[PDB]
Amino acid sequence: TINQLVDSTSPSTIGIEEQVADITSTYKLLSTYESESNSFDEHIKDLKKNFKQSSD
Amino acid sequence: RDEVIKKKNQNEYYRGRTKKLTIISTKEDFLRSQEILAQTEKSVF
C-alpha cells in the first residue's frame, strides 16, 4: 500500500497527510493487536506452567 | 496496485497529449503565401 501510494499519488496534489496518518494509526492499532496476542500467548504459557506446578 | 499500474499507463498518455500534437503548417503556410505574394492582380484583370 505504501509503494502504490507513492506510485499513484500526484506529487502536485497535496492531501495525503490524512491518508498516511489514518493508516499510521491503523497500523499502530494492528501492531497493538499483534502485541496483545503475543502477550496473551506469553501469559498463556506462564499461566500453564504455574497452573501445572500448582496442580501437581 | 492495479490502479497504480493503470494510472502509470495514463501518465504515458504522455504520448497521449504529446505524441498526438500545430505550427508546422503555420510556419510553412506563411512561406507559401509570402512566396506566392510576389507571384501575384484583379486591377490588371
UniProtKB/Swiss-Prot annotation, chain A:
It is found in: Nucleus; Cytoplasm. Signal peptide: none annotated. It comes from the Eukaryota. Belongs to the NSE2 family. Present with 2800 molecules/cell in log phase SD medium. Component of the Smc5-Smc6 complex which consists of KRE29, NSE1, NSE2/MMS21, NSE3, NSE4, NSE5, SMC5 and SMC6. Acts as an E3 ligase mediating SUMO/Smt3 attachment to SMC5 and YKU70. Acts in a DNA repair pathway for removal of UV-induced DNA damage that is distinct from classical nucleotide excision repair and in repair of ionizing radiation damage. Functions in homologous recombination repair of DNA double strand breaks and in recovery of stalled replication forks. This is E3 SUMO-protein ligase MMS21. It comes from Saccharomyces cerevisiae (strain ATCC 204508 / S288c) (Baker's yeast). The lineage of its organism: Eukaryota, Fungi, Dikarya, Ascomycota, Saccharomycotina. The gene is MMS21. The chain holds residues 44 to 99 of 267 of the full protein.
UniProtKB/Swiss-Prot annotation, chain B:
It comes from the Eukaryota. It is found in: Nucleus; Chromosome. Sumoylated by MMS21. Present with 892 molecules/cell in log phase SD medium. Belongs to the SMC family. SMC5 subfamily. Acts in a DNA repair pathway for removal of UV-induced DNA damage that is distinct from classical nucleotide excision repair and in repair of ionizing radiation damage. Functions in homologous recombination repair of DNA double strand breaks and in recovery of stalled replication forks. The flexible hinge domain, which separates the large intramolecular coiled coil regions, allows the heterotypic interaction with the corresponding domain of smc6, forming a V-shaped heterodimer. Component of the Smc5-Smc6 complex which consists of KRE29, MMS21, NSE1, NSE3, NSE4, NSE5, SMC5 and SMC6. This is Structural maintenance of chromosomes protein 5. It comes from Saccharomyces cerevisiae (strain ATCC 204508 / S288c). The gene is SMC5.
